[PDB]
Homo-oligomer: A and B are copies of this chain.
Amino acid sequence: GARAVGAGLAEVFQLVEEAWLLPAVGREVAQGLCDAIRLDGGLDLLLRLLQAPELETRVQAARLLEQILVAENRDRVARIGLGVILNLAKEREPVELARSVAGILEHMFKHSEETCQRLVAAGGLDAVLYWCRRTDPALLRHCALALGNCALHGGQAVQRRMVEKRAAEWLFPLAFSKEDELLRLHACLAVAVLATNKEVEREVERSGTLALVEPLVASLDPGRFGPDDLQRLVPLLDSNRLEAQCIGAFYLCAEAAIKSLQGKTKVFSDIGAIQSLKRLVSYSTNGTKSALAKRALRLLGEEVPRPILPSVPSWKEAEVQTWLQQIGFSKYCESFREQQVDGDLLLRLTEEELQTDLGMKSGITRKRFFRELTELKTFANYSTCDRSNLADWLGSLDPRFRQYTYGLVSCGLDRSLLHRVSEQQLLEDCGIHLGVHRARILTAAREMTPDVFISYRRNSGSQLASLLKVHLQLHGFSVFIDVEKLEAGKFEDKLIQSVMGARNFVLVLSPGALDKCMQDHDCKDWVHKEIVTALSCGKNIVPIIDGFEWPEPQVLPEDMQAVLTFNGIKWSHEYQEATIEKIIRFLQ
């Protein structure tokens, strides 16, 4: 298309790129071209400049290198990308080119796995995790997507290492930051991805940054805004999770609402995200994800008829036909209607009936079918039949057991009369084909307040509260925070109980934090309520000041006058290792 000049080259002082040597032409250009001159543009000299002394030229060349905007450039740096890591390690000083090197990493993980392993092993994660501690509206938006890449690109050998290094914890503050909603999206995507290898879901949930995804995507709008993210997002809305299915659906409605302004309706036909969206709508018990998926699927086409009724044991021919529509078996919708397949002739179905009558000759198709039948028998509402509530006794062994509930209650078996069943009876009658499930069912049938609380300004002190929470959680203290639940929790109860139950109370005093709380002599402001309840126990309240002038007691109402009597510990955005260890002795 259009053409860019061959800019002159000096190699004299590197001052010639003080404006990056070509701003707003092929780089920082926003025209109808959209193509970077990065191909054949730039060479090895940048690596040398980063390797060089005189940190000013290091900063300039790193700023330039933040535009690894093509495949071959990433390959070529990966061939020699160790000067990057030396830049990381030696450059951890708060000198503010972290905005550049962290962005290099962000752009660099998206390469093959081996790059991610060598970076993570050789102090690569150390930099991004350490710079998720610094305050900047654009550096953090680099670290967040860096971690999201390292988790989404890299396989399990690096996800496990990330989580060992507490990636989810250090990724919490990025999610819980009032400003930069795109930063919250880029942090919650990373946590959702990390919570999709089952070996880690325990630790990610221990972190506390996972649930916060739900009251983040429930509010924002697909009008908000990684190569082939789609084949790497579909495993986010195939998960058995809510905090990850919501992100998968939101990102996919975003990347289907900005697909050439009009979609493409073929890329999703290859990745097969539309079918998984259909079964995300159908068996969905939620509104958030079932609305995001609904509008995304409408953007693509053919919204599913219903979120099908939860009570299978009492469907009829009609409901079953509608379900067969919803699960790709529309072709067989005739035979399941020529045989009057009721809602029991679909939960007491087996392979011989399918093999002969219904036409499903291909054993693969009856393996797919029973995959869907198991994803529906674990969703069903066995209330019209399950007298003794066997389903909860099954789904409490292995959530894949619940599918057998109907088998075990179409034969009278209940909680009482189950200690007298034997493997032959289970196999022939209850239809529990897998010998391992039979063995586990017989075995299980035969044998039969957080440490500290941070109350804070919900508009300015949130940023400091996030870091305090994650620092102290990595220091062995359990912490509760307000917005882990909601933002509208103005009502009195459901959180004060922990406030007196808290073993400590650290208050983030940001400047002007008392503007809304002042003149609220009614104590209507419910953080002013929290400040009032701070003095309830005298439970070692340790205020943390941040540039907030320490106000005089007389202007301050007596319900919170005595709070300032306790000393306020200075907080420095730098050297937080020292401040936290200063704070630990004030905790107990």
Majority DSSP secondary structure for residues of A touching B: loop
User: Is A497 positioned at the interface, with any CB of B under 8 Å from its CB?
Assistant: no
Q: Give A409's nearest chain B residue, CB to CB.
A: B198
> What is A's interface to B at a CB cutoff of 8 Å?
75, 78-79, 82, 86, 89, 112-115, 155-156, 159, 196-199, 218, 231, 234-235, 238-239, 270-272, 285-287, 307, 309-311, 314, 316-319, 328, 339-342, 344-345, 348, 352-353, 356-358, 361-365, 367-368, 371, 381-389, 398, 400, 411-413, 417, 420-421, 424-425, 428-430, 434-437, 439-440, 443, 488, 491
Extra contacts, 12 of them, besides A341-B364, A357-B364 (Cβ < 8 A), are A82-B488, A199-B387, A199-B388, A239-B384, A339-B365, A342-B368, A344-B371, A356-B362, A411-B434, A412-B436, A425-B439, A428-B435
Judge whether A383 and B156 touch: CB under 8 Å.
yes
Give 13 CB contacts A-B under 8 Å. A114-B286, A198-B383, A198-B385, A198-B386, A231-B309, A234-B314, A270-B318, A272-B318, A345-B364, A345-B367, A356-B362, A424-B435, A429-B436
Hey, which chain B residues are within 8 Å of A425, CB to CB? 435-436, 439
Q: Which are the 10 A-B pairs with shortest beta-carbon distances?
A: A197-B383, A198-B387, A156-B383, A272-B316, A339-B364, A425-B435, A411-B436, A357-B362, A235-B314, A199-B389
Q: Are A383 and B114 in contact (CB under 8 A)?
A: no
| B368 close to A363 (CB less than 8 A) | no
Complex CA–CA separation, A399 to B420 (angstroms):
19
The interface residues of chain B lying within 8 Å CB-to-CB of A398 are 412
- Closest chain-B Cβ to A110's Cβ sits at a distance in Å of 14
Residue of B nearest to A200 (CB): B383
Closest residue of chain B to A489 (Cβ to Cβ) is B82
Residues of chain B within 8 A of A340, CB atoms compared: 328, 364-365, 368
Q: What residues of B have a CB within 8 angstroms of the CB of A436 in the complex?
A: 411-413, 421, 425, 429-430
Q: How many copies does the complex hold?
A: 2
Complexed CA–CA distance, A207 and B396 (Å): 30
A115 CB to nearest chain B CB (Å): 8
Q: Inside 8 A of A285's CB, which chain B residues have their CB?
A: 113-114
Q: Are B112 and A307 in contact (CB under 8 A)?
A: yes
How far apart are A313's CB and chain B's nearest CB, in angstroms? 9
In the assembled complex, the Cα of A274 lies from the Cα of B288 at a distance in Å of 37
Roughly how many angstroms separate A234 CA and B318 CA in the complex, as a whole number?
13
In Å, the complex CA distance between A383 and B388 comes to 33
Q: Nearest B residue to A349 by beta-carbon distance?
A: B364
Query: Which residues from chain B contact A400 at a C-beta distance below 8 Å?
Result: 412
- Whether A235 lies near B386 (C-beta < 8 A) is no
CB-defined contacts of A345 to chain B, threshold 8 Å: 364, 367-368
In contact, A412 and B440 (Cβ under 8 angstroms): yes
Chain B residue contacts of A342, Cβ below 8 A = 368
A388–B368 Cα distance when bound, in Å, is 25
Q: How far is the CB of A307 from chain B (nearest CB, A)?
A: 7
- When chains A and B are docked, how far (Å) is the Cα of A156 from the Cα of B313? 13
Alpha-carbon separation in the docked complex, A287 to B286 (Å) = 44
Task: Please name all residues of chain B whose beta carbon is closer than 8 Å to the beta carbon of A112 when the two chains form the complex.
Answer: 287, 307
Contacts of A156 in B (CB 8 A): 381-383
CB-contact partner of A272 in B231, B317, B362, under 8 A = B317
